[PDB]
DNA sequence: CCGAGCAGCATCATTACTTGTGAGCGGATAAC
DNA sequence: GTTATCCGCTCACAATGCCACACGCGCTGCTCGG
């Protein structure tokens, strides 16, 4: 049809000349031209090819690929065939059949906004207003203020401030969709319920951007209003936040908390030795909250508190142990949250970043499901304000350097040295040579990794009303990453220790290391073999992405038929699950 | 001791010990250098015009005697401006006028010319030029061209390591590439087989070439393996020896010579057999017949009288055919020798392979292999063979590729043909034989010795030269049907295709684009770039995981860390900052000649396999101060390796440790501490930073400043030093010094600073004035800081004071917590500048209108416009308003004469008025600066474009005013002080005005002599200057160039005033980006004990993981300097006594170690100590080399220098809770970009709108005011769910079903939620194209 | 957008899709050389019927 | 006469290092 | 010779999603046309 191949014109006489009309016009011109030779006596030798030329037109219009080449004029590129507007990523099959550019919803780029709850999120008022504008008028003129669309877009227009409160009425449990770019898995797309915030950003909780793998280097994510009623009652049931804790790849809980607030939790379930207000007795976590908060104690220092641990012995009751436990006014503090549950024995310890995993998941279990989103959202707000109030900073001489470490090099240094000796008077084979200097080399990497270790987990010495103790260290390194906040101890060694070998493009090893560090400089050289290494694996990332892509979506194809159907089909044959063994342990 | 008139403004204070021998070259050698050598009249022919032209010339005829030959060229004179072809919007052209000769030979006779005409400066095509920022100057626009990066053209041995055959089959196979022509390859088959073969055609048994070169068998076999004599003695079949002959493999019986018995019985010729086989010196072996069992025959054999074969080349010798042949003879029998382990018999089988055997029968063989189909005749394949090569038309390998061929051959002649030939066939052949037995050695492609470089000069001959060869046919051809005396040299050749291809190569090439003109950095590091894609490169498709990465031979060559993150990483490099590109094409990189013991300064710039062949040392080893090395055991790298060597053992040293860096890297401080998996993100952020309303020097730089600013264009150099007689906010007027003026031209010269202009990336460029009045200025000093820059320095960002804390999770990721303070000292808030151009057709039914007066819509939508239509220049104008203006020939089809006459004098001008007017796009507001206007002549202008035009005119007269006031004075003083030489006149001149002293009455013989002189004098200046100010004015009033049917042109431009807010995106330099979260007020964010507050509060748990130690230092050198800024404010407050602050500010710059600059303060006279000082206020300036930077002991001694903890933390106070925090944290000045990634060019939304016409789904962007494109990926997480109504609606009722979606938008507003699904429009779409097909589709009827 | 038209071709001519997606379903409908239908096709050789 | 539209064009050799894989076909290679 | 067997070669067929922004998209000696 003509619509489906339109000539749309440009500011002047300039169409676009869709390539399905210029192969058309080719191929009406060649029918015409022989059909007036057929009637013109047709010498032989001319219609026959004259015919092949049309058969090759023809062709070319069904398909612009086989046989050879069409392509168009000025432009050195083929015509775009009938197949090709069904075929490849463009044809109307992966471009507006199966995924089709929706109309209704908005786009934006992302902030953390953290005083909202789980299930909320942030939403700019533009962005609102330009969505619910159907809304809008619905509950203008069912209030009367505007009887008439036109006046409608008039006051919508002119933002009087009863379009605002109309707006904030209308979405007040009305759901949508936050939705990141790359939608890898079933979480990529999820529901909240919005509220009004200024700027132009997208405020979302913090916990479920890590569940997108949602960062805030300026991601964009985009929204999506479900309108019919169905719809909005599914939105909530179903992908709204508060409903997926569990990932659906393994039931480990998909809303952990990553950074910025484990680090403050682990900060307060410390234990300083002889901190201000060691040894006192409290008569409960308000009353220590209270005596932390007027500076009359220090946030974590050992003291004696009575605390009623509530239990569910059989099912349905609640016993209340009112003991007296020795804790940290921490602990004590952060035991105002936990709801009525859990022993107290799961807030006593230093309370890492696995630790607060393994809380999440035995609340739960335990108390099923709300109390649990009630306690997450607690456990983030608190995480927040008692790291702020902490002051966790680094500062270059944080990371200390491990004295010996020096020496070390010296001596492996030295090491490799004679080593030459040993090659340089032939006395022992090249590639023995080679492997015994990698493997001294590792030897003294690993020598200087545990120096700068045990000078760092535990360099602080203090004094408890007396001579001298060893605690583990209050350094701001070591508290990231013990407290597993960011980043493991392979990254601390890399950082302060020596960086340790790198790698040839091949993958081979190059024989003398990196002898420096990053608090210390690094010779050039040093940097370019840091750099061959990155940029391997930058590539890797840049290239595995779409490899990625493509594979999970033959998988989706492959399987996007399997729906469970039936309840039971009654069988008995059933494969042999087993615990596995690959010759080292299971 | 050598400061500038400038930098003695503000004297960065610089680490690094390393006292740099050679300073940093121009940043822009590759353009500049490569445009010259493409466009400077070359007498050489080597390369540039001249080289194209000796190519594509001399043309010849139909060997009718009649060519046309060339003698040279030259340049025309660009008509516009690089200002006026800037803003007229045209190119910077050059008219093109070639020096030609037809000449035309006497027949039927011996050569002469009875029959030529000469014509010099036939015009061909316009070229264009490249202005003096490297840059080109297409239409309106200004494009640059990266410079690419391809293999060598030449000779090279791939393996392909077992990845065919799967069974250590690596094939060697060897392939020649020429500058020009079509390539050509040798294979080794899976079956240890040659072929030789073109691009990509069947694989052909190789010795066919060679038969193709006139080849026969007996010398064919000759040229690729030994001879194995044998001697026929009077018996046991006598043969030569030489025990590495025999050495080989097992063996197979006992070869005793000459009785002696060495090779044992049996097998296993052992190296100690063969020594005392060679002690023996062995010249004859008895031998037995059957020992003889393959030994493929060399030399053909016939009887003496029957002429017949007996024993033909190459077939076998056996038992039977030796008995056979010793019938007849013989006293002469060659073999050849043969081996697993080396000389193996590839040559011979494939000759056993080989179809044909004849030379023409080759030639045939290879016509129908190369294209098949057609008729196989001698003189065809002789032409198609010997014009594939040989032909110095179709064909030339190159200068560079006959060096790169010659010294991969092991051959001496450094410079020879450029053209194959048959030894150099057969070598290749040689050699690749050689590859498959032990000899020999494989070398990659990713070597930079074998990827040169090409800048934009050659690839510009080169589509010149393309553009050219068709041109020469086509006038080969009209030289040969036309008369060939009849004409005149002067259009049988058309300039229009020559035009046409260096002009869609300039304008339309994968490589040409526009810059990325947001940033002087990015500017500079988008023109030094090196590419690997684009023509004659690989696609990033298929770009291999391999090529992307670096290769030990990129250390100073290519920048290892600049690269864009993404697709295309490694195929888009940066040079280093000392590199230079090869008198070929590769990378040099400079190094210092290390001798004996010394390092001396002699540099040299070494290619990649010089530097191979060598040892190089580390820039990092310190030094003796005199050449000497202060170690024993000095770490190097000799062959792309790194070991430790004597001091002896060396041979070159590295010339700074700058050199392995990008030059955007270069601004990157405290790089060393750094990683570089994030030092990357880094430099691309600091390529995309933006310039802000008052720019401000970076206290933490890498002194590359000065260079990076400075060679940049965007800063307004002086060219000749002189005094400031005038400045103001738009034009400065250099009074030239005395000396450094030619001797006439007063020439007191004119900087004209650009003002507000747009952006290729719509971000405004404004130049102010940071020179004084009446300060002297130098040669080559900076007079006007360009778009974020300062005093000539790089100022990209903002140095803000930051604390690294967390705070209330505001800073959750890595977003970035600012105050309001930043806002309302307009820190961030920048410009946008972006154009909106309404044209004016000319429809058939009649030409636009551009007339203020609109039909339907009323004075309000009006009023901003003038009687014009065109708005007056500052009128805010806001969203969905109308710029302009123009109404159009709406109706046709009337045909009533009877109101046609009535309208043809009362309608005419209202018969079909349509207003498509211009109508800034929804959503952006700004205020608007300008108005520029091209009109179509002949239609004779607008009151606007009048306007402007008489405006321009006056502008451009005042300078030639001001030249003509100089000049003026200049000879009314001559006059005086000539005229005092007799009347008297010596108190007249001086009380009297101006009024008639060119008619004062003295003297005659000298004396109104002179008053003649100077009167002829005066007359032809104000002439001349009458002149030349027309020429402006006709220059300026002239239309303009419009070609398909345009009248008038009207641009307009808005300026936004954008300030920071929630959702923007800013990143220091150390690629630790983020989104700012929250403009928290003032008194909320923490603030130090004496109350000064601090501005950003960023992440700290941001650094452990992404490993970015930099910064943080970075910081605390920020606080140091900082530090030391208020310590001068406070000597500033109260008026402190000078020397005091001299002092103290000397003391400060002594505080290095050992430091390469040491500046004095003395010859500073009190005021420039003051003005120093006035400039220092805000904290001194720390340079930082990138490699050598100042250890954390000097950072340490800085800090106690001010009054600041050495800790580099400090205690604070929540201005919410009022307490402290316990934990002193860390909070010092690092420095902060603002990326174009603000969030008001993202945030969009949509309720309902335009519809795509092809199908009914909504279209997209941001611009169309689309939706969203709910793709594969979101279905699938759908469904994943139940979200069974929601995809559902999502798919019909949301975005298709025109009646569906309709009725849903009227459903709703009557507050129902119901969906109606119908039919997605795509669906029927679908159905209807796939019917287009014969492939019958339809719904089923159940 | 739905009315769609048609051309009287003046020759027969063949189906790009039947006859060179491998395997040609021509070609298996005759038990025929893909090779000889295209060449008998584009009009170089004569099919004796 | 000369500008504006226009009708079917490989416009010679317009070349073109792989990307990785699968399927099929013409022809070498071996059993009956 | 047949008969099928397998193999080298050829040719088709796949290349993450979004976005955003930018840029650009007949011609040319026949045809017509007054
Ligand atoms: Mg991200």
């Given at each position: 049809?003509?619509?489906?191949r339109?000539?749309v014109?440009?500011?002047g006489?300039?169409?676009?000349?869709?390539?399905?009309?210029?192969?058309y016009?080719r191929?009406?011109n060649?029918?015409?031209?022989l059909?007036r030779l057929?009637?013109?006596?047709?010498?032989d030798?001319?219609?026959?090819?004259?015919?092949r030329?049309l058969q090759?037109?023809?062709d070319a219009?069904?398909?612009n690929?086989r046989?050879?080449?069409?392509?168009?004029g000025?432009?050195?590129?083929?015509l775009?065939?009938?197949?090709d507007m069904?075929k490849?990523k463009?044809?109307?099959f992966r471009?507006?059949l199966?995924?089709?550019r929706?109309?209704?919803?908005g786009?934006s780029?992302?902030?953390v906004?953290?005083?909202?709850?789980?299930?909320?999120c942030?939403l700019?008022?533009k962005?609102?207003?330009?969505?619910?504008?159907p809304?809008?008028?619905?509950k203008?003129?069912?209030?009367?203020?505007?009887?008439?669309?036109?006046?409608?877009?008039?006051?919508?227009?002119?933002e009087?401030?009863?379009?605002w409160?109309?707006?904030?009425?209308?979405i007040?449990?009305?759901?949508?969709?936050?939705?990141?770019?790359?939608?890898l898995?079933?979480?990529?797309?999820?529901?909240?319920?919005p509220?009004?915030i200024?700027?132009?950003?997208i405020?979302?909780?913090?916990?479920?951007?890590?569940?997108?793998?949602?960062?805030?280097?300026?991601?964009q994510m985009?929204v999506?209003?479900?309108?019919?009623?169905?719809?909005?009652?599914e939105?909530?049931?179903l992908?709204?936040?508060?409903?997926?804790?569990?990932?659906?790849?393994?039931?480990?809980?998909?809303?952990?908390?990553?950074?910025?607030?484990?680090?403050?939790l682990?900060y307060?379930?410390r234990?300083?030795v002889?901190?201000?207000?060691?040894?006192?007795?409290?008569?409960?976590?308000?009353?220590?909250?209270?005596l932390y908060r007027?500076?009359?104690?220090?946030?974590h220092?050992?003291?004696?508190?009575?605390?009623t641990?509530?239990?569910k012995?059989?099912?349905?009751?609640?016993?209340?142990?009112?003991?007296?436990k020795?804790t940290?006014v921490?602990?004590?503090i952060?035991?105002?949250?936990?709801?009525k549950?859990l022993?107290?024995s799961?807030?006593?310890?230093?309370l890492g970043?696995?630790?607060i995993?393994?809380?999440?998941?035995?609340?739960?279990?335990?108390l099923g499901?709300?109390?649990?989103?009630?306690?997450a959202?607690?456990i983030?707000?608190?995480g927040?304000?008692?790291?702020?109030r902490?002051?966790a900073?680094?500062?270059?001489?944080?990371?200390?350097?491990?004295?010996?470490?020096?020496?070390?090099?010296?001596?492996?240094?030295?090491?490799?040295?004679?080593?030459?000796?040993?090659?340089?008077?032939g006395?022992?084979?090249?590639?023995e040579?080679?492997?015994?200097?990698?493997?001294?080399?590792?030897?003294?990497?690993?020598?200087?990794?545990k120096?700068?270790?045990?000078?760092?987990?535990?360099?602080?010495?203090?004094?408890?009303?007396?001579?001298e103790?060893?605690?583990?260290?209050?350094?701001?390194?070591?508290?990231?990453?013990?407290?597993?906040?960011?980043?493991?101890a392979?990254?601390?060694?890399?950082?302060?220790?020596?960086r340790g070998?790198?790698?040839?493009?091949?993958?081979?090893?190059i024989?003398?290391?990196?002898?420096?560090?990053?608090?210390?400089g690094?010779?050039?050289?040093?940097?370019?073999?840091?750099?061959?290494?990155a940029?391997?694996?930058?590539a890797?990332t840049?290239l595995?992405?779409?490899?990625?892509?493509?594979?999970?979506?033959?998988?989706?194809?492959?399987a996007?038929?399997?729906?469970v159907?039936?309840?039971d089909?009654?069988?008995?044959?059933?494969?042999?699950?087993?615990?596995?063994?690959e010759?080292?342990?299971? | 001791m050598?400061?500038?008139?400038?930098?003695?403004?503000?004297?960065?204070?610089?680490?690094?010990?390393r006292?740099?021998?050679?300073?940093v070259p121009?940043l822009?050698s590759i353009?500049?250098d490569s445009?010259?050598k493409?466009?400077?009249?070359?007498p050489?022919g080597?390369?540039?015009?001249?080289?194209?032209?000796r190519?594509?010339?001399?043309?010849?005829?139909?060997?009718?005697?009649?060519?046309?030959?060339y003698?040279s060229?030259r340049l025309?004179?660009?008509?516009?401006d690089?200002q006026?072809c800037?803003?007229?919007?045209?190119?910077?052209?050059?008219?093109?006028?070639?020096?030609?000769?037809?000449?035309?030979?006497?027949?039927?006779?011996?050569?002469?010319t009875?029959?030529?005409?000469?014509?010099?400066?036939?015009?061909?095509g316009?070229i264009?030029?490249?202005?003096?920022?490297?840059?080109?100057?297409?239409?309106?626009?200004?494009?640059?061209?990266?410079?690419?990066?391809?293999?060598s053209?030449?000779?090279?041995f791939?393996?392909?390591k077992?990845?065919?055959?799967?069974?250590?089959?690596?094939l060697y196979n060897?392939?020649?590439?020429?500058?020009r022509?079509?390539?050509?390859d040798?294979?080794?088959?899976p079956?240890?087989?040659?072929?030789?073969?073109?691009?990509?055609?069947?694989?052909?048994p190789?010795?066919?070439?060679?038969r193709?070169?006139?080849?026969?068998?007996?010398?064919?076999?000759?040229?690729?393996?030994?001879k194995?004599?044998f001697?026929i003695?009077?018996?046991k079949?006598?043969?030569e020896?030489?025990?590495?002959?025999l050495?080989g493999?097992?063996?197979?019986?006992?070869?005793?010579?000459?009785?002696?018995?060495?090779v044992?019985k049996?097998?296993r010729?052992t190296?100690?057999?063969?020594?005392?086989?060679?002690?023996?010196?062995?010249?004859?072996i008895?031998?037995?017949v059957?020992?003889?069992?393959g030994?493929?025959?060399?030399?053909?054999?016939?009887?003496?009288?029957?002429?017949?074969l007996?024993?033909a080349?190459?077939?076998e010798?056996?038992?039977?055919?030796?008995?056979?042949?010793?019938?007849?003879?013989?006293?002469?029998?060659?073999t050849?020798?043969?081996?697993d382990?080396?000389?193996g018999?590839?040559?011979?089988?494939?000759?056993?392979?080989?179809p044909?055997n004849?030379r023409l029968?080759?030639?045939?063989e290879?016509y129908?292999?190369?294209?098949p189909?057609?008729?196989?005749?001698?003189e065809?394949?002789?032409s198609l063979?010997?014009?594939?090569?040989?032909?110095?038309?179709?064909?030339?390998?190159?200068?560079?590729?006959?060096?790169?061929?010659?010294?991969?051959?092991?051959?001496?002649?450094?410079?020879?043909?450029?053209?194959?030939?048959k030894?150099d066939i057969?070598?290749?052949?040689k050699?690749?034989?050689?590859?498959?037995?032990?000899?020999?050695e494989?070398?990659?492609?990713?070597?930079?010795?074998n990827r040169?470089?090409?800048?934009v000069?050659?690839?510009?001959?080169?589509?010149f030269?393309?553009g050219?060869?068709?041109?020469?046919?086509?006038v080969?051809?009209?030289?040969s049907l036309?008369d060939?005396?009849?004409?005149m040299?002067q259009?049988?050749?058309?300039?229009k295709?020559?035009?046409?291809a260096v002009?869609?190569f300039?304008?339309?090439?994968?490589?040409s684009?526009?810059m990325?003109?947001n940033?002087?950095?990015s500017?500079?590091?988008?023109?030094?770039?090196?590419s690997?894609?684009?023509?004659?490169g690989?696609t990033?498709?298929?770009?291999?995981?391999?090529?992307?990465?670096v290769?030990?031979?990129?250390?100073?060559?290519?920048?290892?860390?600049?690269?864009?993150?993404?697709?295309?990483i490694?195929?888009?490099?940066?040079?280093?900052?000392?590199a230079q590109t090869?008198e070929?094409?590769?990378?040099?990189?400079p190094?210092?000649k290390?001798?004996?013991?010394?390092?001396?300064?002699?540099?040299?710039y070494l290619?990649?396999?010089?530097?191979?062949?060598?040892?190089?040392?580390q820039?990092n080893?310190?030094?003796?101060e005199?050449?000497?090395?202060?170690?024993?055991?000095?770490?190097?790298?000799?062959?792309?390796?790194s070991?430790l060597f004597?001091?002896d053992q060396?041979?070159?040293?590295?010339?700074?440790?700058?050199?392995?860096?990008?030059?955007?890297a270069?601004?990157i401080?405290?790089?060393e501490?750094?990683?570089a998996?994030?030092?990357?993100?880094?430099?691309n952020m600091?390529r995309?930073?933006?310039?802000?309303?008052?720019?401000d020097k970076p206290?933490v730089?890498?002194?590359?400043?000065?260079?990076?600013?400075?060679?940049?264009?965007?800063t307004?150099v002086?060219?000749?030093?002189?005094?400031?007689?005038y400045?103001?906010a738009?034009?400065?007027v250099?009074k030239?010094?005395?000396?450094?003026?030619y001797?006439?031209?007063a020439?007191?010269?004119?900087?004209?600073?650009?003002?507000?202009?747009?952006?290729?990336?719509?971000?405004?460029?404004?130049?102010?004035?940071?020179?004084?009045?009446?300060?002297?200025?130098?040669?080559?000093?900076?007079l006007?800081?360009?778009?974020?820059?300062?005093?000539?320095?790089?100022?990209?960002?903002?140095n803000?004071?930051?604390?690294?804390?967390?705070?209330?999770?505001?800073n959750?990721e890595?977003?970035?917590?600012?105050?309001?303070?930043?806002?309302?000292?307009?820190?961030?808030?920048?410009?946008?500048?972006?154009?909106?151009?309404?044209?004016?057709?000319?429809?058939k039914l009649?030409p636009?209108?551009?007339?203020?007066?609109?039909?339907?819509?009323?004075?309000?939508?009006?009023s901003?416009?003038?009687?014009?239509?065109?708005?007056?220049?500052?009128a805010?104008?806001?969203?969905?308003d109308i710029?302009?203006?123009?109404?159009?020939?709406?109706?046709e089809?009337q045909?009533?004469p009877?109101e046609?006459?009535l309208?043809a004098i009362?309608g005419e001008?209202?018969?079909?008025?349509?207003?498509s007017?211009?109508?800034?796009?929804?959503?952006?507001?700004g205020?608007?600066?300008?108005?520029?206007?091209?009109?179509?002549?002949?239609?004779?202008?607008?009151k606007r474009?009048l306007?402007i035009e008489?405006?321009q005119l006056?502008?451009?007269?005042?300078?030639?005013?001001?030249?003509?006031?100089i000049?003026?004075?200049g000879?009314?003083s001559?006059?005086?002080?000539?005229?005092?030489?007799?009347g008297?006149?010596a108190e007249?001149?001086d009380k009297?005005?101006r009024?008639?002293?060119?008619?004062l009455?003295?003297?005659?013989?000298?004396?109104?002599?002179?008053?003649?002189?100077?009167?002829?004098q005066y007359?032809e200046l104000?002439?001349?200057?009458?002149?030349?100010?027309?020429?402006?004015?006709r220059?300026?009033?002239?239309?303009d160039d419009?070609?398909?049917?345009?009248?008038?042109?009207?641009?307009?431009?808005?300026?936004?005033?954008?300030r920071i807010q929630?959702?923007?995106?800013?990143?220091?330099?150390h690629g630790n980006?983020?989104?700012?979260?929250?403009?928290?007020?003032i008194?909320?964010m923490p603030?130090?004990?004496?109350?000064?507050?601090?501005?950003?509060?960023?992440?700290?748990?941001?650094?452990p993981?992404?490993?970015?130690?930099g910064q943080?230092?970075e910081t605390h050198?920020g606080m140091?300097?900082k530090?030391i800024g208020?310590?001068?404010?406070?000597?500033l407050?109260?008026?402190?006594?000078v020397?005091?602050?001299?002092?103290?500010?000397?003391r400060?710059y002594?505080?290095?170690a050992?430091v390469?600059?040491?500046?004095?303060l003395?010859?500073?006279?009190?005021?420039?100590?003051?003005?120093?000082?006035e400039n220092?206020?805000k904290g001194?300036?720390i340079?930082?080399?990138?490699?050598?930077?100042?250890?954390?002991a000097?950072?340490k001694?800085?800090l106690?220098?001010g009054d600041l903890?050495?800790?580099?933390?400090?205690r604070?106070?929540?201005?919410?809770?009022?307490?402290?925090?316990?934990?002193?944290?860390?909070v010092?000045?690092?420095?902060?970009?603002?990326?174009?990634?603000?969030?008001?060019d993202?945030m969009?939304?949509?309720?309902?709108?335009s519809?795509?016409?092809v199908?009914?789904?909504?279209?997209?962007?941001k611009?169309?005011?689309?939706?969203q494109r709910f793709?594969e990926?979101?279905?699938?997480?759908?469904?994943?769910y139940?979200?069974?109504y929601?995809?559902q609606?999502?798919?019909?009722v949301k975005?298709?079903?025109?009646?569906?979606?309709?009725?849903m938008?009227?459903?709703?507003?009557?507050?129902?939620?119901q969906?109606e699904?119908?039919m997605?429009?795509?669906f029927?779409?679908?159905?209807?194209?796939?019917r287009?097909?014969?492939?019958?589709?339809?719904l089923?009827?159940? | 957008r739905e009315?769609?038209?048609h051309?009287?071709?003046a020759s027969?001519?063949?189906?790009?899709?039947?006859?060179?997606?491998?395997?040609?379903?021509?070609?298996?409908?005759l038990?025929?050389?893909?090779?000889?239908?295209?060449?008998?096709?584009?009009?170089?050789?004569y099919?004796?019927?």
């Open positions: 049809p003509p619509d489906l339109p000539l014109p440009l500011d006489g300039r169409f676009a000349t869709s390539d399905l009309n210029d192969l016009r191929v009406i060649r029918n015409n031209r059909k057929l009637d013109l006596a047709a010498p030798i001319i219609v026959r090819n004259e015919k030329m090759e037109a023809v219009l069904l398909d690929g046989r050879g080449r069409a392509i168009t000025s432009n050195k590129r083929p775009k065939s009938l197949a069904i490849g463009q044809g109307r471009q507006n199966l995924g089709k929706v109309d209704y919803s786009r780029v992302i902030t906004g953290p005083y909202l709850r789980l299930h909320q942030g700019p008022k962005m609102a207003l330009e969505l619910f504008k809304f809008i008028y619905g203008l003129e069912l209030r009367g203020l505007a009887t008439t669309i036109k006046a409608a877009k008039k006051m919508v227009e002119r009087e401030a009863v379009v409160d109309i707006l904030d009425e209308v007040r449990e009305h759901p949508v969709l936050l939705n990141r770019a790359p939608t898995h079933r979480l990529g797309i999820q529901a909240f319920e509220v009004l200024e700027g132009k950003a405020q979302l909780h913090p916990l479920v951007c890590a569940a997108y793998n949602a960062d805030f280097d300026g991601d985009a999506h209003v479900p309108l019919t009623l169905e719809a909005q009652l939105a909530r049931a992908m709204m936040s508060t409903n997926n804790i569990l990932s659906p790849a393994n039931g480990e809980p998909i809303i952990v908390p990553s950074q910025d607030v484990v680090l403050g682990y307060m379930t234990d300083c002889n901190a201000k207000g060691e040894g006192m007795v409290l008569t409960g976590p308000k009353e220590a909250e209270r007027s500076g009359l104690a220090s946030l220092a050992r003291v004696k508190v009575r605390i641990e509530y239990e012995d059989a099912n349905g009751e609640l016993v209340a142990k009112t003991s007296l020795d940290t921490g602990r004590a952060l035991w105002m949250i936990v709801p549950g022993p107290y799961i807030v006593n310890q230093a970043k696995k630790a995993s393994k809380m999440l998941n035995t609340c739960y279990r335990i499901l709300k109390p649990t989103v009630i306690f959202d607690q983030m707000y608190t927040f304000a008692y790291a702020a902490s002051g900073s680094v500062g270059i001489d944080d990371m200390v350097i491990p004295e010996k470490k020096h020496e070390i090099i010296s001596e492996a240094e030295a090491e490799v040295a004679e080593i030459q000796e040993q090659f340089q008077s006395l022992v084979t090249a590639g040579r080679y492997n015994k200097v990698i493997d001294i080399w590792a030897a003294a990497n690993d020598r200087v990794s120096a700068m270790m045990d000078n760092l987990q535990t360099e602080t010495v203090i004094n408890r009303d007396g001579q103790e060893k605690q583990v260290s209050f350094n701001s390194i070591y508290m990231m990453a013990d407290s597993g906040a960011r980043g493991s392979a990254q601390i060694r890399q950082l302060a220790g020596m070998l790198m790698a040839k493009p091949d993958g081979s090893i024989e003398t290391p990196i002898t420096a560090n990053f608090r210390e690094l010779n050039v050289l040093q940097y370019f073999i840091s750099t061959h290494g940029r391997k694996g930058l890797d840049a595995k992405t779409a490899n990625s892509g493509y594979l999970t979506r033959r998988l989706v194809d492959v996007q038929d399997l729906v159907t039936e309840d089909c009654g069988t008995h044959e059933g494969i042999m699950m087993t615990p596995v063994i010759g080292g342990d299971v | 050598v400061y500038s008139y400038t930098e003695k403004k503000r004297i960065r204070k610089d680490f690094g010990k006292p740099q021998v050679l300073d121009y822009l353009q500049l445009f010259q493409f466009i400077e009249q070359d050489e080597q390369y540039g015009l001249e080289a194209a032209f190519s594509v010339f001399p043309i010849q005829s139909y060997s009718g005697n009649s060519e046309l030959q003698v060229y025309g004179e660009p008509v516009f690089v006026e800037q803003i007229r919007g045209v190119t910077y052209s050059a008219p093109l006028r070639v020096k030609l000769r037809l000449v035309i030979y006497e027949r039927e006779a011996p050569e002469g009875v029959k030529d005409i000469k014509e010099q400066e036939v015009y061909m316009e264009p030029l490249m202005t003096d920022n490297g840059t080109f100057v297409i239409n309106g626009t200004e494009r640059v061209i990266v410079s690419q990066l391809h293999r053209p030449g000779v090279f791939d393996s392909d077992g990845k065919t055959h799967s069974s250590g089959k690596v060897a392939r020649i590439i020429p500058y022509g079509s390539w050509l040798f294979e080794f088959d079956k240890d087989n040659l072929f030789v073969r073109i691009d990509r055609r069947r694989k052909l190789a010795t066919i070439i060679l193709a070169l006139n080849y026969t068998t007996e010398q064919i076999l000759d040229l690729f393996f030994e194995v004599i001697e003695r009077d018996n079949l006598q043969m020896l030489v025990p590495e002959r050495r493999e097992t063996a197979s019986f006992d070869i005793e010579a000459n009785g002696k018995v060495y044992e049996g097998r010729i190296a100690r057999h063969i020594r005392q086989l060679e002690k023996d010196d062995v010249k004859l008895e031998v037995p059957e020992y003889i069992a030994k493929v025959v060399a030399k053909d054999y016939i009887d003496e009288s029957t002429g017949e007996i024993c080349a190459n077939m010798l056996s038992l039977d055919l030796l008995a056979k042949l010793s019938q007849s003879g013989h006293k002469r029998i060659e050849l020798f043969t081996n382990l080396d000389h018999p590839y040559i011979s089988e494939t000759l056993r392979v080989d044909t004849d029968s080759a030639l045939v290879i129908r292999m190369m294209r189909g057609e008729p196989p005749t001698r065809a394949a002789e063979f010997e014009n594939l090569f040989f032909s110095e038309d179709r064909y030339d390998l190159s200068a560079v590729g006959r060096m790169k061929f010659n010294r991969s051959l092991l051959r001496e002649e450094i410079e020879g043909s450029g053209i194959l030939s030894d057969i070598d290749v052949m050699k690749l034989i050689d590859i498959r037995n032990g000899k020999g494989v070398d990659d492609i990713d070597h930079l010795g040169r470089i090409r800048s000069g050659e690839m510009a001959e080169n589509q030269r393309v050219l060869v068709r041109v020469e046919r086509a080969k051809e009209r030289l036309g060939l005396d009849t004409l040299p259009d049988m050749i058309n300039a295709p020559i035009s046409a002009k869609e300039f304008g339309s090439s994968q490589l684009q526009f990325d003109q940033n002087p950095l500017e500079i590091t988008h023109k030094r770039r090196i690997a894609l684009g023509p004659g690989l990033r498709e298929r770009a291999g995981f391999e090529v992307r990465d290769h030990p031979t990129h250390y100073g060559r290519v920048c290892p860390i600049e690269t864009p993150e993404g697709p295309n490694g195929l888009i490099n940066s040079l280093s900052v000392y090869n070929y094409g590769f990378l040099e990189t190094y210092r290390v001798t004996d013991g010394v390092v001396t300064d002699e540099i040299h290619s990649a396999i010089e530097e191979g062949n060598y040892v190089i040392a820039a080893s310190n030094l003796d005199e050449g000497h090395f202060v170690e024993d055991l000095v770490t190097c790298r000799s062959k792309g390796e070991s004597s001091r060396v041979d070159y040293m590295d010339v700074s440790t700058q050199q392995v860096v990008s030059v955007g270069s601004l401080p405290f790089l501490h750094d990683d998996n994030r030092a990357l993100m880094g430099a600091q995309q930073a933006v310039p802000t309303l008052r720019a206290l730089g890498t002194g590359m400043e000065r260079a990076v600013a400075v060679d940049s264009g965007v307004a002086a060219k000749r030093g002189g005094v400031v007689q400045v103001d738009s034009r400065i250099i030239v010094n005395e000396d450094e003026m001797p006439g031209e020439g007191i010269d004119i900087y004209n600073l650009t003002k507000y202009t747009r952006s290729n990336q719509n971000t405004c460029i404004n130049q102010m004035p940071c020179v004084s009045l009446g300060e002297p200025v130098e040669r080559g000093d900076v006007a800081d360009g778009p974020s820059t300062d005093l000539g320095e790089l100022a990209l960002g903002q803000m004071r930051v604390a690294f804390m967390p705070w209330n999770g505001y959750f890595d977003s970035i917590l600012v105050s309001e303070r930043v806002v309302q000292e307009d820190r961030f808030t920048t410009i946008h500048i972006q154009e909106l151009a309404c044209v004016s057709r000319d429809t009649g636009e209108e551009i007339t203020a007066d609109i039909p339907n819509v009323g004075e309000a939508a009006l901003k416009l003038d009687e014009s239509g065109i708005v007056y220049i500052g805010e104008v806001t969203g969905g710029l302009v203006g123009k109404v159009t020939p709406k109706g089809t045909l009533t009877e046609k006459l309208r009362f001008k209202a018969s079909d008025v349509k207003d007017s211009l109508r800034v796009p929804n959503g952006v507001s205020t608007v600066i300008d108005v520029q206007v091209f009109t179509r002549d002949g239609v004779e202008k607008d474009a306007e008489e405006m006056k502008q451009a007269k005042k300078d030639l005013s001001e030249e003509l006031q000049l003026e004075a000879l009314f001559r006059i005086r002080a000539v005229l005092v030489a007799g008297v006149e007249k001149l009297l005005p009024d008639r002293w060119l008619e009455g003295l003297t005659d013989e000298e004396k109104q002599n002179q008053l003649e002189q100077l009167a002829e007359d104000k002439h001349e200057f009458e002149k030349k100010l027309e020429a402006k004015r220059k300026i009033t002239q239309g419009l070609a398909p049917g345009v009248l008038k042109i009207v641009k307009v431009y808005l300026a936004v005033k954008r929630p959702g923007d995106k800013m990143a220091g330099r980006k983020g989104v700012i979260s929250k403009i928290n007020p008194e909320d603030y130090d004990e004496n109350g000064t507050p601090v501005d950003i509060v960023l992440n700290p748990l941001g650094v993981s992404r490993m970015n130690i943080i230092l050198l140091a300097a530090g208020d310590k001068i404010n406070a000597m407050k109260q008026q402190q006594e020397a005091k602050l001299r002092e103290f500010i000397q400060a002594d505080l290095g050992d390469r600059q040491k500046v004095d003395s010859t500073f006279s009190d005021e420039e100590v003051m003005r120093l000082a220092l206020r001194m300036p340079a930082t080399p990138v490699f050598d930077g100042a250890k954390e000097e950072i001694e800085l106690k220098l903890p050495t800790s580099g933390q400090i604070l106070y929540d201005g919410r809770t009022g307490e402290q925090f316990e934990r002193p944290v860390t010092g000045y690092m420095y902060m970009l603002k990326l174009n990634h603000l969030v008001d993202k969009h939304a949509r309720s309902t709108g519809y795509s016409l199908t009914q789904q909504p279209l997209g962007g611009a169309q005011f689309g939706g793709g990926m979101e279905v699938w997480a759908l469904e994943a139940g979200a069974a929601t995809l609606e999502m798919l019909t975005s298709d079903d025109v009646n569906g979606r309709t009725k938008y009227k459903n709703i507003v009557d507050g129902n939620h969906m699904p119908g997605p429009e795509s029927n779409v679908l159905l209807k194209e796939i287009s097909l014969g492939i019958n589709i339809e089923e009827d159940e | 009315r769609m038209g051309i009287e071709l027969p001519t063949a189906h790009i899709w039947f006859l060179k997606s491998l395997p040609s379903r021509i070609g298996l409908l038990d025929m050389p893909l090779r000889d239908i295209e060449r008998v096709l584009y009009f170089e050789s099919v004796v019927i």
